Subunit: 214 residues, 4 copies
C-alpha cells in the first residue's frame, strides 16, 4: 500500500483555519497535513507494525533530526498497544543522525553525523523510523550501513513518501502519507533548521524559502 | 468563515488507513473527518471563542446527545487557554437534550426531552454547543427557547454545517466543518443511537443503514 | 479492589507546581488529584470494564452534571481498546441528571431532572458512570430508578469514593480513587456550578467557599 | 522552584492500579511517578520556560537517550503556548548523546557519542533538556562543553533531581520532581537499555535487576 494518498490537487488548508505560531505565519503558505491527522494515521501504522513484528523484540532506530517527532509518537502508540493488549513488542531505542539537505534540496552527499553504533544491530530486528522518503538517497544509504552488520530483519516506517521525478524508487515497509512534489516543513521537518517546532506539516511560502535561504 | 469546507467531489478516506472498531467495519463506507482533524480545528475554534467572548463569564450549553463530544473537547481547549495565560473565560456548564431524528431524516418534531432549566440563562452570555446544523429546525427551536429567558447574549458553535437544499438557512457563529449532503456518524453523532462510540466522523454504508434501521 | 487510596493526612500539591485557571487562583487551596493521574487511572478502569463487560453490548449511562468529564474520558479509553483489538464492547449512550447539592452539602431532596427514557435500559447491560459517591443518596436513588426498567445487568463506575461518616456505605463496581472527607472541585465537579472548568481535582479554599457560597 | 518534592518513604503505586507493558510485568516494583503526573508538571514547566526565555529565539538541546521523552513533551507544550498566544519562542532543536552508566552505576567517565555541533551555539540562548541529575557529573561535563562555545545564555531543565549523598550539588533552572535515592526507570530512563519503552517512571523489582543486569 502507498498510504494516505494526497493528490497534486489537494488544496490543503488556509492557515487561518488552525492555530499556527505567529512567527511562522509570514513564512507558511498552507496547512498540508494537520497534526491530528498525522496522529490518526500513525495510530494505524502502529497497529500495522504490531501485526508485522508483534511477536518479536525490536530495536527502533530513529533517523535524526527530522524523524524525531514521528519516532516519539509512533513508539507511544505501540506502547499503548503493549500495555492494553495480549500482543507485546518489547523495544530498545537507538538514534542515528544523517545530513544531506541544504535549503529545499539534497546535496547528494549523505553524512553520518555520528551514531554509527549500527554494529550492535547484528542479529536484531530493526525498525527504522524516518520522516520522509524524497530522492531515497538517505534511506538507501542507511539501509546499506545497517545491512552491513547482518541484522535479523529490517523494516522501514516513513511518515511521508514524495512523488518526485528525482526519486530512486525506494518504497518503505510502512507509509503514512504519499505527497506531491512540494517541500514541506513542520512536525520535526525543517528548512535550514527552522520550522521543526511546528505542530502541523505545512508548505513553505516562496518568501519563506527566500527569507531562510542558506 | 464557513469553516473548513469539505467539497462535494471529496471521497474521504479509506477505512483501511485508520483504526475503527471492528464491530462497525461493514457498517461504514468511508472516514469523512478524522478525529485528529476535528481536534485541530476545535483548538482554533476555542481560540476564536475566547477572542469573541473571552472578556466575560460564559455559560456553555451542550445540546445532547449529539453535541457531547464536541462540547467536551471544545471546553477542554478553552480551559487549556484559561490556565496558560491571564486570558480567562470563567465557564459554567449546562445540558439540554432535544430530539427529532429517526434513521436519517428529521421527523420535523423537535421534542425537548428534558431541558427547561433555561431560566438560569437570564442575563447570562450563552454559548450553545451543537454537533451539526442540517435543516436548522433544532437550532431555530433552541434559539427561540433560550430567547424566552432573556440571556445577555447568545452565540452558537456547531462542529458541522451541512450543505443541503433542506436547510432553513441558519448559520452559526462558529463552524468547524461545512460538509456535503451526507448523513455522517461518529464523534457522538448517531444513527438510531449507534455509531456514537466512534472517534472519526464517517459516512454510513447501506448495510449499516439497514442493519440498524429503526 | 478499593481503587487508589488517598489517606487523610495527604494535603495535595501547592497550586504553584501546576497550571491552574487564574480566575480560580485564590479560590483553590491545593491540587488534590492531577488531571493526568485521573487519566492514567481511568485508562486501567477502561481495561477493567472491558474485562468484565467486554463480551457484551453496553449502554453507558452518564450521571449529569458531575460525571460528564469522567464519562467522556472513560468511554474514550474504552473506544481506544475497541479499535485496536478484536475485543469490542459496542456501546450506546444515555444521560441522566440528578440534583441535590447546595454549597458543599446535600440538600436531602434529590431531583431527577430528566430521566423517563430509562425505559431504553430494559433488558440491556448498563454501565452507570458517576463522579463521586459521598452520602450514597444519589446512586441509591438512581439504582432504584434504573431497576424499575428491568435492565439485564447494572454496573457502576465512580471516579471517587469519599471516606465519610455520612456515607450509607455504597460501593461501586469500579472505583478510581478513595478519598478523605473533603469537598473537592474540578474535573466537572462543582461548588454551586463553579469549578467545573477545571482540569485537576482540587480542594476549595475558604475564600472560594465564601465567595461562591449560595 | 524546587519542583515536586517526593519524600524518602514515598510508596508509589501497586502496578495493578495502572496499565503497564506485559513484558515488564515481573520486572517492576511500583509505579513511582505516573505518566499523567509527569505531563501535568511538564505543562507548568513549559510556561515557566516561556516566562523566562519567551522573548527570544532558543536552541533546545536534547541530552540523549534518557531525556528524549521529556524533551519531546516539554517542547510540545511550549509549541502549544506558541501557537495559542502572542508570545512565541521560535526554537531550533539539537541533540547530544552522553553515556556513563552501567546498571545503576555511574562510571564517572562520560563519553560524548555525538554532539560536536556545539560550535553552532555561539551567541545563542540554550535550553538543555535532561532526564535526571544524579551525581551531577553528566550535566557538569555538558555545561563545560557548551560554555566552551560562548552561548548567549544557558538554562537547564531536568525532569528529575535525585537526593543523593553522591550528588555534587548542582541545581537546574527548571526541575520537575525531586526524588529519593532510588534508581528509577521508564519515560525514556533505562536500566541497561531496558525500560525506555515504558510511560510511567517506576522502581525496578529484584527480578528485573537480575534479568536485565549487565
Ligand atoms: N522538511 C523537509 N525535509 C525533507 C527531507 C529530509 N531529507 C531526508 C530524505 O532525503 P532523501 O530521500 O532525498 O535522501 C529525510 O531525512 C528528510 O529529513 C527530504 N525531503 C524533505 C521535505 O520535503 N521537507
Ligand atoms: N449522526 C447525524 N446526526 C445528524 C443530525 C441531528 N439532528 C440535529 C440537527 O437537525 P436539523 O438541523 O435538521 O434540525 C442535530 O442535533 C443532530 O444531532 C442532523 N444531521 C445529522 C447527520 O447527518 N448525522
Ligand atoms: N464537586 C463536588 N460534588 C460532590 C458531590 C455530588 N453529589 C453526588 C453524590 O452525592 P451523594 O452520594 O452524597 O448522594 C454526586 O452526583 C456528586 O456530583 C458529592 N460530593 C461532592 C464533592 O465533594 N464535590
Ligand atoms: N534510568 C535512570 N537513569 C539515570 C541516570 C542517567 N545518568 C545521567 C545522570 O547522571 P549523573 O548526574 O550521575 O552524571 C543522566 O543522563 C541519566 O540518563 C542517572 N540516574 C539515573 C536513575 O536513577 N535512573
Ligand atoms: Mg533527515
Ligand atoms: Mg532537514
Ligand atoms: Mg442532536
Ligand atoms: Mg441523532
Ligand atoms: Mg452529580
Ligand atoms: Mg454538583
Ligand atoms: Mg542520560
Ligand atoms: Mg541510562
Amino acid at each position: 500500500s502507498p498510504g494516505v494518498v494526497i493528490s497534486d490537487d489537494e488544496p490543503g488548508y488556509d492557515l487561518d483555519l488552525f492555530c499556527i505560531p505567529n512567527h511562522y505565519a509570514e513564512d507558511l503558505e498552507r496547512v498540508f497535513i494537520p497534526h491530528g491527522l498525522i496522529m490518526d494515521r500513525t495510530e494505524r501504522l502502529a497497529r500495522d507494525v504490531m501485526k508485522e513484528m508483534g511477536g518479536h523484540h525490536i530495536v527502533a532506530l530513529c533517523v535524526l533530526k527530522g524523524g524525531y517527532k514521528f519516532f516519539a509518537d509512533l513508539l507511544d502508540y505501540i506502547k499503548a498497544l503493549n500495555r492494553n493488549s495480549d500482543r507485546s513488542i518489547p523495544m530498545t531505542v537507538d538514534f542515528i543522525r544523517l545530513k544531506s539537505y541544504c535549503n529545499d534540496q539534497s546535496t547528494g552527499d549523505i553524512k553520518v553525523i555520528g551514531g554509527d553504533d549500527l554494529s550492535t544491530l547484528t542479529g536484531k530486528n530493526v525498525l527504522i523510523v524516518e520522516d520522509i522518503i524524497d530522492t531515497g538517497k538517505t534511506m538507501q544509504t542507511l539501509l546499506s550501513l545497517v545491512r552491513q552488520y547482518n541484522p535479523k530483519m529490517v523494516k522501514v516506517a516513513s511518515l511521508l513518501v514524495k512523488r518526485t521525478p528525482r526519486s530512486v524508487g525506494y518504497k518503505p515497509d510502512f507509509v503514512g502519507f504519499e505527497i506531491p512534489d512540494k517541500f514541506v516543513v513542520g512536525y520535526a521537518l525543517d528548512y535550514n533548521e527552522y520550522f521543526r517546532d511546528l505542530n502541523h506539516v505545512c508548505v513553505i511560502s516562496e518568501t519563506g524559502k527566500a527569507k531562510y535561504k542558506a
